[PDB]
Design a protein around this ligand. Sequence first.
Ligand SMILES: C[S@@+](CC[C@H](N)C(=O)[O-])C[C@H]1O[C@@H](n2cnc3c(N)ncnc32)[C@H](O)[C@@H]1O
Ligand SMILES: C[S@@+](CC[C@H](N)C(=O)[O-])C[C@H]1O[C@@H](n2cnc3c(N)ncnc32)[C@H](O)[C@@H]1O
Ligand SMILES: Cc1cccc(-n2c(=O)nc(N(C)C)c3ccc(Cl)cc32)c1
Ligand SMILES: Cc1cccc(-n2c(=O)nc(N(C)C)c3ccc(Cl)cc32)c1
Lengths: 380, 380
Amino acid sequence: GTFLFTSESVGEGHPDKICDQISDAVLDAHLQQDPDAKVACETVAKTGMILLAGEITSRAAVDYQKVVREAVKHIGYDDSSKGFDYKTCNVLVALEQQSPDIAQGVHLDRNEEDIGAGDQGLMFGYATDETEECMPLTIVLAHKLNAKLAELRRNGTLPWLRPDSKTQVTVQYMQDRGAVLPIRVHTIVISVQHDEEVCLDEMRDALKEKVIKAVVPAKYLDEDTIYHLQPSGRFVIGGPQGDAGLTGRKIIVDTYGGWGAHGGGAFSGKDYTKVDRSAAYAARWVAKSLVKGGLCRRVLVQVSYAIGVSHPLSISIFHYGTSQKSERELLEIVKKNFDLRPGVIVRDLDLKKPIYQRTAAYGHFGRDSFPWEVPKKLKY
Amino acid sequence: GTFLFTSESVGEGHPDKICDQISDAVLDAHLQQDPDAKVACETVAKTGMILLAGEITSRAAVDYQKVVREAVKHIGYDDSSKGFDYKTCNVLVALEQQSPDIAQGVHLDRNEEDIGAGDQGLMFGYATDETEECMPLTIVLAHKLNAKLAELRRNGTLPWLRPDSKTQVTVQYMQDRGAVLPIRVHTIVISVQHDEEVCLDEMRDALKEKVIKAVVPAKYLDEDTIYHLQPSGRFVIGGPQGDAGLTGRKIIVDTYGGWGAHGGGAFSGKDYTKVDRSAAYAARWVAKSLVKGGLCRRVLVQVSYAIGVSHPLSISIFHYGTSQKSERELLEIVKKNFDLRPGVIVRDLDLKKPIYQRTAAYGHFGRDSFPWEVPKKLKY
Ligand SMILES: C[S@@+](CC[C@H](N)C(=O)[O-])C[C@H]1O[C@@H](n2cnc3c(N)ncnc32)[C@H](O)[C@@H]1O
Ligand SMILES: C[S@@+](CC[C@H](N)C(=O)[O-])C[C@H]1O[C@@H](n2cnc3c(N)ncnc32)[C@H](O)[C@@H]1O
Ligand SMILES: Cc1cccc(-n2c(=O)nc(N(C)C)c3ccc(Cl)cc32)c1
Ligand SMILES: Cc1cccc(-n2c(=O)nc(N(C)C)c3ccc(Cl)cc32)c1
């Protein structure tokens, strides 16, 4: 009954993640002034360049140069020696208003509760009782390894670290009637951008002793665990200089690390009317409510929409065999307890609040008691 | 035991899909001259602009202006009245060489069979016996609806059609010991860009009579099927003018429509050393070989890699309860029959051949007998 499963995560300076954080810094800057801003901000990053492309209709006055540069500064790209510098990079803006054809079909002259979905699409939510935060251990550990790298970079413990990093964790699990039980960590990968002076052996030793051992419980590590630390051998060129980044290219890192399911939509740079984000947050809220409510040990929820239509077109449940109730009975409980119209989700999850940049690294789920992480008490 | 499931697809002129097709036109242009080109081409599309950003190291001499414009011409954006014109749009190029740090860690001075993975990551393959092509009916139908729109646009049957489209299909299924059996189509969405002259009722009638009825078998449609045809009411502004597009933003449309699983990596614009593409193709080949070989009715395969390491770090199997063999026995059969090193996948699947633009619309799987769609005969 044992099996392996692998998930990855990336750091704040991974170029795709830089784009997600900038897109959400732009969204938050608009929402601080106009809670009803319509935002669809894509970011592209390559050597020396941040380009903003997309559609924004808002009453806010946003200084894009300042917002972008402050986000890059926070990430830590502040000198040409690191491959990217917020002070001197090019910031290009190609932002237009939201299409009036979309606006008239989605929200113009509509009661807020009855606003249409901002697009068609499908979205999923997942929760698992294997961790207290109801997330897969593989992705939790992968995120925490990147967070540890950023912490040691920022506190000057490992001054050779740079912001761009990737991690990957393979866990060996057992299964019990559809629920999963972590046994041990089988393999860990860490790749992190570094300065020209540090030796490979010094980095590998520090990654094992100061990063992995500070994150992963010793009970999961043994003489057979496989470590791939700086496996490329050299990672001096990094950030956008090493690899072009785009918003919405880390959608599996943002969610469940390959567990559960994904409908394809990106989260960052989008206001609540874009159901790719709001309905995925609501589906996570449903799934976590079912698991914390004791109905399931793990569960997957699908929802779907049509542009301009408020009610979901479909809702579906997969309980992995971890409920005494059938999937039909769980679906009836979901329909009795949740209203997944976007104009109701916005109110339940407070989605006009400018907290989005906080979601744009280390996963959107299983952290910080955001509204979609506070279970709803179910009536049935 | 009945349940709903929804998948979507998009047309050739959807702005994200335009980017995937351009990225793969660039990859094919390089491979036509240099089978060993290292390509990581991202495309961004917005009003009047195609930007290429990424990393290419190749001996080819490629005219990017010509390759991009020819791809846009093929899609059908050939006049400012349609919102985008290959003849007059801006083509911007921000392409640099592949990082020498990546090159030395992945492929320099390595025997081809022993080349390292081009990145870390996780990838999945899926197959289901519900259709002869071993794909979910939801996504097959969604793709065929977009293909039908493009066919009627190109043959002049519906001259008001423009290239940008989206479709979505919800199927009601029954289940039989983990396998799925389609019963009926519950809901269909179609949104397609159109000219200024055609009436909404004329479009809705044509979409039902000439598109849906020409694609979906009548046995799946009944008086209760729900149709959302042009649900926004107006879609004149479209293509990149209506919504910025990026490469690798339709990864679920490219794969299984939400069924199976996804590791997050995009396919388009990448050569075989980028395991996000090559190992996902190989995992599809494994899954389809298990189902066509009669071992499973449906199956999911995960594989994962570390940058610079040739052998996968992990391989895992989920058979949904549709095999008499355990997942451990199926995994042993996979390990005995397949070698998922990227330097072996390239040979088995002929991945230096310039056929990639053909994959970049209507899904990478279940079509055209590409090498990953030809099952391997298994020995056990
Ligand atoms: C390996 S690059 C992707 C392939 C790349 N576009 C190419 O031209 O081959 C993807 C990510 O890996 C990381 N990376 C970049 N350079 C690296 C190196 N030398 N060693 C390890 N990882 C690296 C960065 O996080 C980067 O965003
Ligand atoms: C609805 S747009 C996404 C949201 C958009 N970025 C915004 O500013 O609100 C996503 C896709 O839907 C399609 N689309 C664009 N305009 C549309 C319209 N008026 N009606 C229906 N679908 C439309 C196009 O395929 C487009 O790429
Ligand atoms: C459909 C789907 C999607 C995503 C993940 C899984 N999935 C999972 O939830 N449970 C696993 N167990 C308990 C054996 C499992 C093992 C291997 C693989 Cl490849 C996937 C697995 C399933
Ligand atoms: C883990 C995972 C990922 C993706 C899809 C599914 N999955 C599926 O394979 N089979 C379904 N059956 C048979 C009931 C199903 C029904 C509802 C939902 Cl939300 C998902 C379903 C499962």
